[PDB]
Amino acid sequence: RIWNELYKVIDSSDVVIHVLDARDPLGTRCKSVEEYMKKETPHKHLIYVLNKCDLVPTWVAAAWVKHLSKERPTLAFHASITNSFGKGSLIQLLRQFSQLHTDRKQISVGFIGYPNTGKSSIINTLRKKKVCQVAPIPGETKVWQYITLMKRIFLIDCPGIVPPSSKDSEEDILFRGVVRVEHVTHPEQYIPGVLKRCQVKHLERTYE
Amino acid sequence: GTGKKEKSRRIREGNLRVKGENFYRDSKRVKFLNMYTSGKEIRNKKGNLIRAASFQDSTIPDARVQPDRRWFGNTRVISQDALQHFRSALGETQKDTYQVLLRRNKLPMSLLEEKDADESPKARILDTESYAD
Amino acid sequence: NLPVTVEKPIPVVYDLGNLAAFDSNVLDKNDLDSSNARREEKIKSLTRDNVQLLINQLLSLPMKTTTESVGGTGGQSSVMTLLQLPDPTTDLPREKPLPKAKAMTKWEKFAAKKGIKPKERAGKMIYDEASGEWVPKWGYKGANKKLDDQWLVEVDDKVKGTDNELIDPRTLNRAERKRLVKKNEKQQRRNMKN
Amino acid sequence: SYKSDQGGKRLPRIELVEIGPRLDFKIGRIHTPSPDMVTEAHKKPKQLEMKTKKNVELDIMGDKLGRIHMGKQDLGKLQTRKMKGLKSKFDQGT
Amino acid sequence: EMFKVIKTGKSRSKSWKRMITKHTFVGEGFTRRPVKMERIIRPSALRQKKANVTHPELGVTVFLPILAVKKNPQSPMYTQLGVLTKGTIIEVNVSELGMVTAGGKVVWGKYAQVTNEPDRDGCVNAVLLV
Numbered sequence: 164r165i166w167n168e169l170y171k172v173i174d175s176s177d178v179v180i181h182v183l184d185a186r187d188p189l190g191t192r193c194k195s196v197e198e199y200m201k202k203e204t205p206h207k208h209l210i211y212v213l214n215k216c217d218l219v220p221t222w223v224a225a226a227w228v229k230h231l232s233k234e235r236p237t238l239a240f241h242a243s244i245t246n247s248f249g250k251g252s253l254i255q256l257l258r259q260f261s262q263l264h265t266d267r268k269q270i271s272v273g274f275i276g277y278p279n280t281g282k283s284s285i286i287n288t289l290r291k292k293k294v295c296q297v298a299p300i301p302g303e304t305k306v307w308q309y310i311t312l313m314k315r316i317f318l319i320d321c322p323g324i325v326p327p328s329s330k331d332s333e334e335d336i337l338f339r340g341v342v343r344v345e346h347v348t349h350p351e352q353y354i355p356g357v358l359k360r361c362q363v364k365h366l367e368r369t370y371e
Numbered sequence: 372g373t374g375k376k377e378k379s380r381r382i383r384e385g386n387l388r389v390k391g392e393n394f395y396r397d398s399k400r401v402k403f404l405n406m407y408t409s410g411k412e413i414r415n416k417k418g419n420l421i422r423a424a425s426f427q428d429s430t431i432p433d434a435r436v437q438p439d440r441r442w443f444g445n446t447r448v449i450s451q452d453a454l455q456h457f458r459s460a461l462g463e464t465q466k467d468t469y470q471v472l473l474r475r476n477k478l479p480m481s482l483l484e485e486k487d488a489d490e491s492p493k494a495r496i497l498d499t500e501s502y503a504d
Numbered sequence: 505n506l507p508v509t510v511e512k513p514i515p516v517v518y519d520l521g522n523l524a525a526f527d528s529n530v531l532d533k534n535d536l537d538s539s540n541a542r543r544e545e546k547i548k549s550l551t552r553d554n555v556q557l558l559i560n561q562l563l564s565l566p567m568k569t570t571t572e573s574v575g576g577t578g579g580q581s582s583v584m585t586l587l588q589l590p591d592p593t594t595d596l597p598r599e600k601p602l603p604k605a606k607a608m609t610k611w612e613k614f615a616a617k618k619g620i621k622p623k624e625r626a627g628k629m630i631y632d633e634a635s636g637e638w639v640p641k642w643g644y645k646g647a648n649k650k651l652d653d654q655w656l657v658e659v660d661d662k663v664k665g666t667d668n669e670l671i672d673p674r675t676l677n678r679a680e681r682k683r684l685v686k687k688n689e690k691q692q693r694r695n696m697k698n
Numbered sequence: 699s700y701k702s703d704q705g706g707k708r709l710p711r712i713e714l715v716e717i718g719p720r721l722d723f724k725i726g727r728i729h730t731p732s733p734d735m736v737t738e739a740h741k742k743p744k745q746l747e748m749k750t751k752k753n754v755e756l757d758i759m760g761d762k763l764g765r766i767h768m769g770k771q772d773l774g775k776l777q778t779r780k781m782k783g784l785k786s787k788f789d790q791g792t
Numbered sequence: 793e794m795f796k797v798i799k800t801g802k803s804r805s806k807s808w809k810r811m812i813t814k815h816t817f818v819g820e821g822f823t824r825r826p827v828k829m830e831r832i833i834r835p836s837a838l839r840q841k842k843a844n845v846t847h848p849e850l851g852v853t854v855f856l857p858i859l860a861v862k863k864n865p866q867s868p869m870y871t872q873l874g875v876l877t878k879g880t881i882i883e884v885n886v887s888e889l890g891m892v893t894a895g896g897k898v899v900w901g902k903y904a905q906v907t908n909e910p911d912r913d914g915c916v917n918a919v920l921l922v
């Protein structure tokens with residue numbers, strides 16, 4: 164059902180925004196969907212939005228933007244209805260896409276990516292209103308949703324997708340914020356992953 | 372309110388006008404908005420079909436193809452010079468990350484995608500020796 | 505082995521589309537007067553230098569080659585190499601004004617208002633049901649004139665009680681068709697007048 | 699055209715032979731056109747040329763391409779989240 | 793037969809949407825219309841890009857890419873919708889057939905006629921018009 168929704172929004176979209184997490188963008192990249200888009204539908208414009216940049220140091224966000232710009236146009240973003248970052252840049256980029264496709268009478272911008280990257284949060288940021296439901300729990304969005312940004316620009320909200328793989332272990336999937344933690348068996352087996360991924364000083368400051 | 376009447380608005384700005392056309396809607400707008408209520412079949416008191424539902428007509432068409440020499444000629448050809456130009460161009464292209472594809476050109480890409488390969492595919496050994504042998 | 509590098513005080517401008525060169529240098533009236541005996545040599549030398557520069561530019565222009573042979577359309581065969589002349593630069597007036605676009609006729613305005621899209625106009629052939637043949641629908645041996653040659657026509661009941669009862673229906677249909685043609689011609693002349 | 703022997707076989711030397719007719723024109727009289735007639739005669743049709751749209755190009759392969767411009771991303775105006783684990787006041791073992 | 797009524801609304805009271813039940817060719821650069829204005833529905837599973845084209849001379853069949861739908865015999869409306877039914881004239885890429893004109897030009901586009909019902913057999917079969 165989720166992948167049916169994904170292919171529906173891709174078939175309906177002119178611009179596709181792939182949303183990455185600023186903490187682990189390579190972890191949150193959907194390379195198979197990118198390759199499908201570049202092979203079968205080359206006329207659809209795929210760009211990167213690096214969300215949650217407020218959770219990383221500024222130089223980390225700058226370096227990730229620089230390295231991802233060697234492949235795709237990448238925009239740093241912080242999604243918030245009241246105090247955001249990058250909203251004007253995203254809006255002017257969308258207006259440029261509309262101007263390029265000024266004979267289409269409207270364009271659609273579909274937001275795809277991993278669960279909990281903040282697709283609904285970015286759409287709410289662009290609309291300056293809570294129009295898509297947002298929750299910290301993954302899978303809050305289930306079906307697609309059309310949002311009218313301007314008269315000629317539609318945004319399409321899509322549920323998060325996790326492409327299947329064999330190298331992606333359960334620990335990697337859990338630490339990408341994909342699964343609901345209340346439904347896992349033994350989280351003490353994953354706590355050493357937290358210890359390896361976090362600084363000792365940061366942990367000791369957080370938990371005293 | 373003589374100035375707010377439908378006639379006076381037509382003066383300020385015969386049989387071609389449709390129902391619903393007013394200060395807010397013209398004829399094309401009216402018919403496009405009636406699309407959302409269009410798809411209904413109309414029947415009379417006795418059950419006769421006054422008008423079939425849109426895109427649901429039941430009349431069998433007479434599907435024929437007339438003889439015409441336009442069917443047997445070539446539709447697309449390409450010269451050797453154009454082929455060589457596109458073959459040389461495919462390889463000179465430096466893709467920029469900030470350029471998007473607006474419209475792909477229609478070309479004989481099977482004739483144009485010819486890259487020199489350093490190795491040959493393996494020979495078909497079944498041509499010389501079968502399983503039974 | 506004469507030199508081929510002409511040196512000039514003011515650099516010559518070029519219009520390669522018109523095969524023309526323009527040098528704006530100083531010319532001596534005493535060296536160019538009709539009294540002198542070297543005036544023709546002076547004119548020849550000036551033209552020589554300007555033509556040398558122009559020919560250098562023309563032979564420095566990019567060239568177009570082809571691999572097609574003779575006997576085909578195009579004119580240029582494999583042995584020929586052609587200079588690619590740029591667009592001309594000198595502004596020259598046209599002989600006639602630009603073709604004005606004809607104003608929209610009554611039919612065109614009506615079709616725009618009612619949103620009628622233009623016809624596909626695939627061809628003039630239609631299938632005649634009674635036979636098994638495709639026939640033109642108008643013109644030479646067209647299907648719009650088959651009633652003229654039909655062997656038997658039933659006289660309509662509505663023609664009774666009129667002075668047109670004794671007239672041939674084929675002749676009546678020819679008259680009606682000609683009246684429609686003349687009505688179309690009159691409408692066209694009206695559009696031309698407007 | 700004669701072989702130059704200094705500019706190679708690609709650049710020949712030019713010479714001229716007059717054919718005539720040689721003419722000396724004295725410029726007696728002039729009748730000039732009006733400016734509106736000049737402008738009407740020097741108008742251009744422009745139906746022939748493809749309309750040039752900004753940020754749109756046609757490449758060597760014949761694909762229509764559009765250009766987008768990101769603009770300046772000033773990350774110095776971004777305030778990162780003031781997490782508790784980044785605060786010196788919650789230091790342990792001092 | 794060609795269209796199927798698609799009802800919308802919570803109580804399924806609106807019936808303006810139609811779905812084409814046959815196979816279609818949509819062409820390059822197809823993007824689905826917004827669902828609020830999408831009257832005619834061509835489902836992606838029924839879309840076609842290639843056909844088994846048979847050359848009457850030399851007796852061979854090749855899987856060729858489709859270029860356009862030239863004429864659907866049922867209606868010009870089905871022609872412009874790209875309906876692929878029996879008898880439809882389509883344009884096919886014949887680059888791999890190695891055809892050359894008398895003037896030397898390489899032929900890479902010709903006409904073919906669909907000879908099967910793709911909605912019945914899952915594939916488009918066509919005969920080249922030579």
Ligand SMILES: Nc1nc2c(ncn2[C@@H]2O[C@H](COP(=O)(O)OP(=O)(O)O)[C@@H](O)[C@H]2O)c(=O)[nH]1
Pocket residue numbers: 214215216217218240241242243277278279280281282283284285296297298299300301302303304323779
């Ligand atoms: N700090 C921070 N949190 C974010 C940002 N964007 C989203 N979130 C949080 O991430 C969670 C998931 O957001 P959501 O929009 O539902 O993700 P989605 O599954 O992609 O739609 C929410 O609790 C948000 O508060 C951001 O830019 N910065």
Ligand code: ALF
Pocket residue numbers: 277278279280282283298300301302303304305321322323324
């Ligand atoms: F992608 Al979501 F909740 F919208 F995980």
Ligand SMILES: [K+]
Pocket residue numbers: 278279297298299300301302303304
């Ligand atoms: K969520």
Ligand SMILES: [Mg+2]
Pocket residue numbers: 282283284295296297303304320321322
């Ligand atoms: Mg969401």
